[PDB]
RNA sequence: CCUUCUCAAACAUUCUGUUUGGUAGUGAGUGAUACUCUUUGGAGUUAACUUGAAAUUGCCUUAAA
């Protein structure tokens, strides 16, 4: 979880203040006297379930605590269907922090800088081994039989 | 419990520090023996960074100079090696946020390159020295009757008489004289004020103090660089500005 | 006779040939006329000045370019099966059909008029042993190149699609939708099969 | 394959036009003089609050 | 001075050995092409394994036809320039094309020291980056830092290991000092390493380049600079695993042993 | 069943016997630790073996470190069955060159060089090459 | 329907570097930053040419 | 979960030229005859190629709580 965020923190969507100051810098320079497309985490449920099924998702992070639970119930199994390497991470607040929002429910990482590419591919393989392989029994077994 | 990541990080950083210290050790040994046949450079540069940050590049003269070495805490994951334990024991700078006066000669300067990632150096002014001694000062001597390890304060001048006296030193201002001007009694009084106890920067973990530590922590790597090469130019900084922050 | 290559190493092997055979006059045959609109854009972009022939372009262009290939010395064209019927040039050494053909029987008549070979992992003269190490490392360069032009994203889109549509409208037992799309996409350089 | 065969738009590859709209709105605001540029905002505080 | 007649006879025997009785060129073409001139000595740099490339001055460029018809070859020839952190902030690729298309050389990619330690720090990404390029150029300062940033596999060849180029006019960076030194390294110099052992081959490259009369001038000047600077033992011209061609043979250097 | 001896692979660049003993000591009292290294130069092959005095301690360490993302490559740990002990892995340092040279006289090696050189000219003639001098 | 200062200066750059080779003009990453077609370019340039000489 | 030895002289000013010195590298494997030394042991070299940083055992503490 800490290692997923050590990557995900490098792609904070440009906050409202940062975007405002930069786009006034564009105006103050370009009006008087080339850039690549920048990469950020992708964070709406309409947009994540858009990105997944279009296979534009390499790592989809799903919150475990959602206000109506029914919202995000299809998502882990739709990710297993599409072949999208997903990880159910703990905390919608903790996802919220990396994305300028209070809460996010979902966070995705479509494209990446090449410096972070190998780390992301290994993050996929670590999550496949740590999450998907340890929890193959979780598609079975009704939870909550605690005496 | 010690995490795995930290325990590998310590070794991975000390690998760089052991190899770095050995590298500087070789070039400084080969510089002294006059066997300058095939090395990087056979002379000594000093970098003086002032304040918009101008990097000067001036060669070190043979002249004896006066430095005030200040302890930093750096770098991150490093454990200090044997060659660092030795020099920092001799300068009595085991404690973080701690200063000392030494004269800089052709023997002192090679040892300065070893401890440069741990210390921040510079030539102080008369006010930096004089205000530092009249604000901070320790004297290790006997207590009431039995206890020895009391370090109290430079409150008096009669204490100065009892401990120094016959060398020509009578008062605290006379100690300031033999420290600012390089004289006979400098080796006498330098080990009398053993080290100084500078307060740390910002000095808190909280709301304002974390953000102020963040601002200063990014100001560190701008106002100080780790050269890591055997021909590392010694970074000299303004001590008048730095001790304005630390007093 | 033939070369055995996977759908990943298909266009990889083709591109490896065209650079070394710049001096010669070789012929590449495709099934679709919407596949050549992709290849004759990539190779002109990566500076192997090939010629373009398909049904979707005008007749005066189709005549005045193919005429130039006949009068050339060093040239190379990309043309389909159906468009190159009846107008064959003797100035040739390699007749290399890339896609599976229209008629499995009429292709024999296409040859004996030049050296013939095919490409088949999912599916006389001699076979050709092929080194795995000396393929050109222009794939990730093409993967970056596809997702940053749009025009070449669209021509690759209708390159991959038209090729695979023609692959399904075949008649043989060999060519009947067996090839997986996780390999065929990387021929046109994709992360997902469009 | 992905579920739908929707053609990808030009705007997913081309530099954004919403960004261009905002920039060319602030440009007007600087010509009019109602937004003071970021370069002069330093000069307004270098002279004041001393 | 070495006999030029024996050099002509050597290359003629190399022509005969290359004219002897698959769809890709895996090994057959390299063993056909690759000439190497061996230079032997009693312990070259006997105790220090430094990675300096000795820039042996040659009258005629072999890199030029190496460009012209590596354009035909599958492995392309592309010119790399490793610079320092202020240089790319100062100088673009377009200025390099402005001043180097005049003679006709092309800078492929300019690379910062930052890029080798962040984006090309992944091992497969690093290996596949450098192995693409044949001419590796590096500004004097960064050269000493480069065994760590690009690793050991980049140093196992002679192509992939960098050449120290001066870009500083009295420590200040100038474009002109780069512009003329790139020319001198390219057309007037052949790089070769110095191992801690005895044997050293000089990668002259493809036999097909610079008609054999020119190859004599190449070999002549190489010997004119390697026997003058160092006392040496033996010289052999060799295409990959031929019966060797003994060219120079000395009996006065061994007397000191 | 299983045994106290453990196999660890995919080790970080600079994770040696010092840190294998120190970190896995926190799991409990380890018996004997090794790490396979190159002999040409003293550095890790990125895999090693260590043994615990307790078999149950071996399986607990395996449960907690089987997929552990640790500075660019995830640790792989495997238990061993009864037998297959830790045998022959030596601490190899950086091996240095030793200068064995002259001993023989200059006139011996000169005529040895003459013998090898004249046979060298008599070697090209064996396979289709004629070369003067 | 006239043209803006920035649009005019953009078409100045395209004409001065290329001229009339619309294939090369639209495959240029530096000047045709918006990946526009040939028809858009010839229409906009003729608007630029009618308002100028 | 730290990030890597980011330049010096001697001579020369053609708007920067010449010369001198500076780098110890992830591991594992495939590999076609040559080089000297050693006396039998490989010692050290010499093309090239494979690879998600891959792998089964060669005899200081305010960088804290």
Curated annotation (Swiss-Prot), chain A:
Protein keywords: Cytoplasm, Ribonucleoprotein, Ribosomal protein
Compartment(s) of residence: Cytoplasm
TM segment ranges: none
GO biological process: cytoplasmic translation; maturation of LSU-rRNA
Keyword Cytoplasm among record annotations: yes
Gene Ontology molecular function: RNA binding; structural constituent of ribosome
GO cellular component: cytosol; cytosolic large ribosomal subunit
Keyword ATP-binding appears in the UniProt entry: no
Top-level taxon in the UniProt lineage: Eukaryota
Chain's role: Component of the ribosome, a large ribonucleoprotein complex responsible for the synthesis of proteins in the cell. The small ribosomal subunit (SSU) binds messenger RNAs (mRNAs) and translates the encoded message by selecting cognate aminoacyl-transfer RNA (tRNA) molecules. The large subunit (LSU) contains the ribosomal catalytic site termed the peptidyl transferase center (PTC), which catalyzes the formation of peptide bonds, thereby polymerizing the amino acids delivered by tRNAs into a polypeptide chain.
Protein family (similarity comment): Belongs to the eukaryotic ribosomal protein eL8 family.
Complexes and interactors: Component of the large ribosomal subunit (LSU). Mature yeast ribosomes consist of a small (40S) and a large (60S) subunit. The 40S small subunit contains 1 molecule of ribosomal RNA (18S rRNA) and 33 different proteins (encoded by 57 genes). The large 60S subunit contains 3 rRNA molecules (25S, 5.8S and 5S rRNA) and 46 different proteins (encoded by 81 genes).
Additional information: Present with 238000 molecules/cell in log phase SD medium.
Name of this chain's protein: Large ribosomal subunit protein eL8A
Gene name linked to the record: RPL8A
Swiss-Prot record, chain D:
Gene name linked to the record: ERB1
Something else known: Present with 2680 molecules/cell in log phase SD medium.
Originating species: Saccharomyces cerevisiae (strain ATCC 204508 / S288c)
Similarity comment: Belongs to the WD repeat BOP1/ERB1 family.
Self-association and partners: Component of the NOP7 complex, composed of ERB1, NOP7 and YTM1. The complex is held together by ERB1, which interacts with NOP7 via its N-terminal domain and with YTM1 via a high-affinity interaction between the seven-bladed beta-propeller domains of the 2 proteins. The NOP7 complex associates with the 66S pre-ribosome. Also interacts with NOG1.
Listed name of the protein: Ribosome biogenesis protein ERB1
Task of the protein: Component of the NOP7 complex, which is required for maturation of the 25S and 5.8S ribosomal RNAs and formation of the 60S ribosome.
Protein's cellular compartments: Nucleus, Nucleolus; Nucleus, Nucleoplasm
From Swiss-Prot, chain F:
Domain annotation RRM: ranges: 4-82
GO terms for MF: ribosomal large subunit binding; RNA binding; rRNA binding
Misc. remarks from the entry: Present with 4280 molecules/cell in log phase SD medium.
Gene it is expressed from: NOP15
Effect of a null allele: Essential gene. Abrupt growth arrest prior to substantial depletion of ribosomal subunits. Fails to synthesize the 25S and 5.8S rRNA components of the 60S ribosomal subunit, and exonucleolytic 5' processing of 5.8S rRNA is strongly inhibited. Arrests at cytokinesis and fails to assemble a contractile actin ring at the bud neck.
Keywords, sorted A to Z: Cytoplasm, Nucleus, Ribonucleoprotein, Ribosome biogenesis, RNA-binding, rRNA processing
Natural source organism: Saccharomyces cerevisiae (strain ATCC 204508 / S288c) (Baker's yeast)
Signal peptide location: none
Shown stretch of the complete protein: 88 to 220 of 220
Known partners and oligomeric status: Component of the pre-66S ribosomal particle. Interacts with NOP7 and RRP1.
Compartment annotation: Cytoplasm; Nucleus, Nucleolus
Protein known as: Ribosome biogenesis protein 15
Gene Ontology CC annotation, any one: nucleus
Curated annotation (Swiss-Prot), chain G:
Modified residues (Phosphoserine): 2, 4
Signal sequence range: none
Location in the cell: Nucleus, Nucleolus
Coiled coil feature spans: none
Family label: Belongs to the NOP16 family.
Quaternary structure and interacting proteins, as annotated: Component of the pre-66S ribosomal particle. Interacts with NOP7, RRP1 and RRP15.
Function: Involved in the biogenesis of the 60S ribosomal subunit.
Additional remark text: Present with 2860 molecules/cell in log phase SD medium.
Protein name according to UniProt: Nucleolar protein 16
Species, as recorded: Saccharomyces cerevisiae (strain ATCC 204508 / S288c) (Baker's yeast)
Record gene name: NOP16
Residues of the full protein shown: 175 to 227 of 231
């Amino acid at each position: 979880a800490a290692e997923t965020f050590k990557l995900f923190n490098k792609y904070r969507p440009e906050t409202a203040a940062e975007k405002k100051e930069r786009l006034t810098k564009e105006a103050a320079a370009v009006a008087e006297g080339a850039s690549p497309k920048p990469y950020a985490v992708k964070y709406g449920l309409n947009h994540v379930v858009a990105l997944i099924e279009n296979k534009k998702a390499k790592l989809v992070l799903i919150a475990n605590d959602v206000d109506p639970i029914e919202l995000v119930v299809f998502l882990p199994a739709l990710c297993k269907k599409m072949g999208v390497p997903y990880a159910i991470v703990k905390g919608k607040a903790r996802l919220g922090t990396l994305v300028n929002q209070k809460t996010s429910a979902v966070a995705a990482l479509t494209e990446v800088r090449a410096e972070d590419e190998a780390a992301l591919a290994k993050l996929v393989s670590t999550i496949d081994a740590n999450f998907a392989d340890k929890y193959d029994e979780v598609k079975k077994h009704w939870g909550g039989g605690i005496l | 419990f010690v995490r795995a990541e930290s325990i590998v990080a310590k070794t991975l950083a000390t690998s760089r520090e052991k190899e770095r210290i050995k590298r500087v050790s070789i070039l400084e040994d080969k510089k002294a023996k006059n066997e300058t046949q095939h090395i990087a450079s056979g002379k000594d540069f000093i970098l003086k960074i002032t304040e918009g940050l101008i990097r000067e590049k001036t060669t070190y003269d043979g002249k004896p100079a006066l430095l005030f070495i200040v302890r930093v805490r750096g770098p991150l994951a490093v454990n200090i090696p044997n060659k660092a334990f030795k020099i920092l024991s001799l300068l009595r700078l085991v404690e973080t946020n701690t200063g000392v006066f030494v004269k800089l000669t052709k023997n002192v300067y090679p040892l300065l390159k070893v401890i440069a990632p741990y210390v921040v150096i510079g030539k102080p002014s008369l006010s930096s020295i004089r205000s530092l001694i009249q604000k901070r000062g320790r004297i290790i001597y006997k207590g009431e009757n039995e206890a020895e390890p009391h370090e109290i304060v430079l409150n008096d001048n009669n204490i100065v008489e009892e401990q120094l006296g016959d060398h020509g030193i009578i008062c605290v201002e006379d100690i300031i004289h033999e420290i600012a001007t390089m004289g006979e009694s400098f080796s006498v009084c330098n080990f009398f004020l053993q080290p100084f106890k500078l307060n740390r920067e910002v000095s808190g973990f909280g709301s304002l103090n974390r953000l102020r530590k963040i601002k200063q922590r990014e100001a560190e790597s701008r106002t100080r660089q780790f050269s890591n090469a055997a021909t590392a130019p010694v970074i000299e900084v303004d001590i008048d500005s730095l001790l304005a922050k630390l007093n | 006779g033939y070369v055995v290559c996977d759908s990943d190493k298909r266009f990889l092997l083709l591109f490896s040939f065209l650079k070394r055979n710049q001096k010669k006059k070789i012929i590449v045959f495709l099934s679709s006329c919407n596949s050549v609109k992709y290849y004759a854009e990539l190779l002109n972009y990566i500076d192997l000045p090939v010629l373009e022939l398909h049904g979707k372009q005008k007749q005066q262009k189709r005549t005045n370019t193919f005429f130039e290939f006949c009068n050339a010395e060093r040239g190379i064209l990309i043309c389909t099966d159906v468009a190159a019927r009846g107008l064959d040039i003797p100035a040739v050494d390699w007749i290399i059909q890339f896609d599976p053909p229209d008629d499995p029987r009429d292709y024999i008549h296409r040859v004996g008029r030049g050296k013939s070979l095919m490409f088949l992992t999912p599916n006389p003269l001699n076979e050709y042993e092929f080194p795995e190490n000396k393929i050109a490392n222009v794939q990730s360069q093409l993967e970056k190149l596809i997702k940053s032009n749009y025009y070449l994203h669209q021509t690759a889109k209708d390159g991959y699609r038209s090729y695979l549509q023609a692959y399904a409208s075949h008649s043989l037992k060999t060519v009947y939708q067996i090839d997986k799309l996780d390999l065929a996409k990387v021929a046109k350089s994709y992360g997902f099969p469009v | 394959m992905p579920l739908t065969a929707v053609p990808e738009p030009k705007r997913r590859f081309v530099p954004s036009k919403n960004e261009a709209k905002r920039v060319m709105k602030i440009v007007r605001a600087i010509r009019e003089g109602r937004i003071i540029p970021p370069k002069k905002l330093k000069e307004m505080k270098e002279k004041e609050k001393i | 001075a070495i006999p030029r007649e024996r050099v002509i006879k050597a290359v003629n025997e190399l022509i005969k050995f290359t004219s002897k009785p698959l769809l890709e060129d895996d090994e057959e073409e390299l063993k056909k092409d690759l000439q190497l001139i061996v230079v032997n000595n009693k312990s070259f740099t006997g105790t220090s394994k430094s990675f300096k490339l000795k820039l042996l001055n040659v009258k005629h460029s072999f890199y030029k036809p190496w460009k012209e018809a590596s354009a035909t070859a599958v492995k392309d020839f592309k010119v790399l320039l490793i610079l320092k952190d202020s240089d790319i902030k100062k100088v673009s690729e377009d200025d390099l094309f402005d001043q180097l298309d005049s003679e006709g050389i092309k800078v492929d990619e300019i690379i910062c020291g930052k890029d080798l330690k962040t984006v090309y720090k992944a091992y497969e990404a690093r290996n596949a980056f450098i192995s693409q390029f044949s001419l590796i150029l590096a500004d004097d300062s960064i050269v000493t830092s480069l065994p760590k940033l690009m690793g050991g596999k980049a140093y196992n060849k002679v192509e992939t290991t960098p050449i120290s180029i001066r870009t500083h006019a009295n420590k200040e960076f100038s474009l002109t000092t780069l512009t003329n030194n790139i020319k001198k390294v390219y057309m007037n110099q052949l790089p070769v390493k110095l191992p801690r052992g005895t044997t050293l081959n000089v990668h002259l490259g493809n036999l097909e380049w610079l008609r054999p009369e020119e190859f004599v001038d190449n070999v002549e000047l190489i010997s004119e600079q390697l026997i003058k600077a160092y006392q040496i033992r033996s010289i052999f011209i060799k295409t990959n695993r031929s019966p060797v061609l003994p060219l120079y043979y000395n009996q006065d250097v061994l007397d000191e042993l | 069943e299983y045994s106290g001896i453990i196999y660890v692979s995919r080790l970080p660049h600079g994770f040696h016997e010092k840190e294998l003993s120190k970190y896995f000591a926190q799991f409990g009292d380890l018996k004997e630790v090794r790490l396979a290294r190159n002999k040409k130069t003293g550095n890790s092959r990125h895999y090693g073996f260590l043994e615990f005095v307790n078999k149950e301690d071996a399986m607990i360490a395996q449960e907690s470190m089987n997929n552990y993302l640790l500075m660019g490559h995830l640790l792989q740990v495997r238990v061993l069955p009864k037998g297959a002990k830790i045998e022959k892995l030596y601490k190899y340092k950086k091996r240095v060159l030793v200068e064995k040279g002259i001993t023989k006289p200059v006139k011996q090696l000169k005529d040895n060089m003459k013998q090898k050189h004249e046979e060298r000219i008599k070697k090209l003639a064996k396979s289709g090459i004629e070369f003067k001098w | 329907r006239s043209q803006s200062e920035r649009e005019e200066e953009w078409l100045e750059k395209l004409y001065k570097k290329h001229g009339d080779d619309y294939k090369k003009m639209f495959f240029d990453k530096k000047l045709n930053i918006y990946q526009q077609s040939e028809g858009d370019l010839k229409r906009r340039l003729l608007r630029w040419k009618k308002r100028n000489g």
